[PDB]
Structures are given as C-alpha cells and as structure tokens.
Amino acid sequence: QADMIVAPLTINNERAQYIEFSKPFKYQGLTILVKKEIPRSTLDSFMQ
Amino acid sequence: QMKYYVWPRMDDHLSIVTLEEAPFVIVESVDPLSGTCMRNTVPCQKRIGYIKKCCKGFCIDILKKISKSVKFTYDLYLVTNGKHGKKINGTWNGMIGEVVMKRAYMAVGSLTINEERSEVVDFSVPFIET
Amino acid sequence: ELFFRSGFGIGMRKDSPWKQNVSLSILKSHENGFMEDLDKTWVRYQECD
Amino acid sequence: FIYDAAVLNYMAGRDEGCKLVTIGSGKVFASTGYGIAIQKDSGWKRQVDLAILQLFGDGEMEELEALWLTGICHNEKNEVMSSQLDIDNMAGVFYMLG
Amino acid sequence: TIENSFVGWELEEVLLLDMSLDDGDSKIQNQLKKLQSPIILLYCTKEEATYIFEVANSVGLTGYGYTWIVPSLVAGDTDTVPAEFPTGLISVSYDEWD
Ligand SMILES: *[C@@H]1O[C@H](CO)[C@@H](O)[C@H](O)[C@H]1NC(C)=O
Numbered sequence A: 001q002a003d004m005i006v007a008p009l010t011i012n013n014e015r016a017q018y019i020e021f022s023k024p025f026k027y028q029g030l031t032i033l034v035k036k037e038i039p040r041s042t043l044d045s046f047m048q
Numbered sequence B: 001q002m003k004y005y006v007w008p009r010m011d012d013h014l015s016i017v018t019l020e021e022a023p024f025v026i027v028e029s030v031d032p033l034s035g036t037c038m039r040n041t042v043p044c045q046k047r048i049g050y051i052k053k054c055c056k057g058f059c060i061d062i063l064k065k066i067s068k069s070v071k072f073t074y075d076l077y078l079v080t081n082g083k084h085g086k087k088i089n090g091t092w093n094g095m096i097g098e099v100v101m102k103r104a105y106m107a108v109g110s111l112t113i114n115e116e117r118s119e120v121v122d123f124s125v126p127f128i129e130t
Numbered sequence C: 001e002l003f004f005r006s007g008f009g010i011g012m013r014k015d016s017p018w019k020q021n022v023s024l025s026i027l028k029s030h031e032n033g034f035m036e037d038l039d040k041t042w043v044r045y046q047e048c049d
Numbered sequence D: 001f002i003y004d005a006a007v008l009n010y011m012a013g014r015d016e017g018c019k020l021v022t023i024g025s026g027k028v029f030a031s032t033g034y035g036i037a038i039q040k041d042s043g044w045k046r047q048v049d050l051a052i053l054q055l056f057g058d059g060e061m062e063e064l065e066a067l068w069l070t071g072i073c074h075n076e077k078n079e080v081m082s083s084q085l086d087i088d089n090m091a092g093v094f095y096m097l098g
Numbered sequence E: 001t002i003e004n005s006f007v008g009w010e011l012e013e014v015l016l017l018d019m020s021l022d023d024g025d026s027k028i029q030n031q032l033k034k035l036q037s038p039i040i041l042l043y044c045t046k047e048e049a050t051y052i053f054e055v056a057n058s059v060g061l062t063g064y065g066y067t068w069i070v071p072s073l074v075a076g077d078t079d080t081v082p083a084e085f086p087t088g089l090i091s092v093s094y095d096e097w098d
Helices: B058-070 B094-100 C025-032 C034-040 D005-013 D045-057 D061-068 D091-096 E027-031 E046-059
Strands: B016-018 B026-028 B042-045 B053-056 B076-078 C011-013 E039-041 E067-070
Touching: B016 B094, B042 B058, B053 B076, B058 D045, B058 D061, C025 C034, D045 D061, E027 E046
Parallel strands: B016 B076, B042 B076, E039 E067
Antiparallel strands: B026 B053, B042 B053
C-alpha cells in the first residue's frame, strides 16, 4: 500500500533487516519526564 | 634477519587505511624489550622504508568487534599523503585518496560525512554524533 | 540523561530505485542550514524554563 | 576556534583548570556523523552496517565512550568560581549619582 | 617462557598421538578434529613424518590458511625432499651451505 514512510521512525537492528533507512534528519535519544515540584517551593514570610 | 620484510600472502584478507589524531586513534612506539606490540594493541606499519608501530584507541576497539562477528581479517597501515582528504584538480588524496585508487578497500578512523565524499565512496550508519 | 541514541530516518521499500538518490538531498540540506530553519520554526520557541 | 565537535568536547573536558568551554553548552550547527568508508558497490556494505546497529542494542557502544571520552571538568550548573567584581559590574550605581 | 612475557602468548588444544602400538586406527584423525589456529607445531622424525601429513592432509586443514614449522630433525641432508611435505613448509636446520 505504501512506497515511503515520512514520519518519526527510529532505527534498530530488527527493522533494518527488511528495509533501508537512508540517513537521519536529526539525532536524539530518549529520556523520562516527571511532574514538577515547584508548588513545594521555598516560600518566605516575615516571621520565618 | 629475514630477506622478507613481511610474509608473502597465501576476499577475507582486507586492507585498511587509518589516520592518527584524537583519542579515537593513538600511535605509540614499540616496546624496546622485544620489538613487538604489547597487549591491547593492533599492529600497524608506516611507510617511509617500513617501520613497525603500535596503534590503539577507541575507534580501533570498534574494528576488533566488527571484524570478529563478520569474520574477516585485516592489517592496518597509516597513510603518508596529507590529511583526511581534499580534492585538488579532480584528484583525491589522503584516506579518501586511497579508497578511490583501490589500494586500500576500506578506511576507518575519524572521517566526516558530506555530499561531496558520497560521490566517490560509500559510508555506513554513523556511530557517533559530530 | 540520554541513554540510547539513534536518529529518525526516511524509510523505503528495499531496493527501490530511490535508495541512494534521496539520501543526498537529506544530507545536502544540512550544509545549507535548511534543516536549521525548519528547526527554529517548528520545535523551539517561547517557553517557561 | 572553529573545529570538529567530537574533538573539542573531549579536549575541553580533560584540561587542567577547566578554563575552556563550548559556547551554548554543547551547541552544534551542521549535524553529520562519523563512519567507515567502503569501496563503491562492495558486497560488504550490507553486513557492516547491520553489525554496528547491533552494538546499540546490547549497550556496548553506550559504555565505551565512558572509557575513552570522559573528563573531570563538569559542565553543569555553569560554575562561576567567584566573580572578582570590577568597575564594570557596578556601572549603574556610578550613574545614579550622575 | 609464555608466562614471563608481556606479549599475550596463548596455547590451547595441545595434542599427543600414540605411535607405539601402531594399530592403524584413526585415533590420530579423531583427536585432530578439534583443532584450529593458523600455526601448528610438529616434532617427529623423517621416516615417521610421511604418515603424519597424510592423515592431516586428508582432512585438509593445511592448504591455505595454515602454516607448519618443523625443527631440524625433519631435514635429512637437504639433498632429497620426500613427498607428502605440504607446500610452503618453513623450517630451520643446522647451517650447511656456508
Ligand atoms: C538521480 O538524481 C540525479 C540528480 O542529478 C538525477 O539527474 C537523476 O535523474 C536521478 N535518478 C533517479 C533514478 O532518480
């Protein structure tokens, strides 16, 4: 049904068996994100 | 003292061409105790008159693992004509210069990929960003 | 910290007649900086850091 | 100095005094990569690339650089090591009376 | 000598054949099946050597990628060369021509 894939597509050994990948747009890995804690920031007051 | 500098040969016997710079490839002089490269090193000649030398580094560590899995042989030798390679009057020198002239058949080390150099040789997937 | 680095690519069916004649335009566009302009107009702009 | 990035970052992280830094905290402009040049239309080109991709999978590639490409001058938090203030820093106060 | 040397000499698959009973069995060939490496050392006599190559050459791990070196014992007088010696045999012997 298709002749070319144009979308974010990583590269790995299993997928490289059956198709070609040319050369990258841009280089990036992968990380983790968690919620911020800035609600629990260091506040201030006169009496502190 | 042997009449032959190197043993005569008897496509799994491939030639490689390398350049020396950065932690990627490091050149060190031979041990004077025995005149051989020590542990964790790959032999590498050097033209100009042939002198033995020891080559080691990060990039060479790749060439050990790749050649072991695909099961082929090699024998490195450093280049003796200029830097990585520059076109002058439609001629190629350096590491690129050897591969186009079929005297090398493969170059490893620290090359940089761009459009001009893909009109003569072919690269593979990059293994470090630059 | 980044722990498995690779890169998005354009994938095609094996041995199509464009295997090697497309990856020059991707590779040449980096020199012109054209890949940079697309970066600063679709990825990075105003934010709270 | 305008040179290849994969050499500067190693060099700027393994220098005494930690007095050298890359602008933009790791800024690169035209992103290309290193590689292994092979003779045109060689039969090996199909196997060498597959081998390299596998080294990503088992993490061998991602720990070798911890063995050859590490430094001590951490480029984190932008350590200033004092300011040693001068005339220039307090410019406005010498202007306020003016 | 191997232990007190910085060069990484290594040895494995040390073989020993029993040419005493001369049963004629393939105990030589069966033992040599588990062999590798391009350098193989030999230490025998000229008369008994011809049998050694025949079985070894029958397997074929002698043609291209394997080199054999023999001490001065298998030399004769360097005037006649008995057959079954593999091509490109390199060996040492007491000086004769000089
Ligand atoms: C390949 O690209 C060149 C660009 O100069 C073009 O002339 C040629 O027609 C292209 N061939 C194919 C098969 O796409």
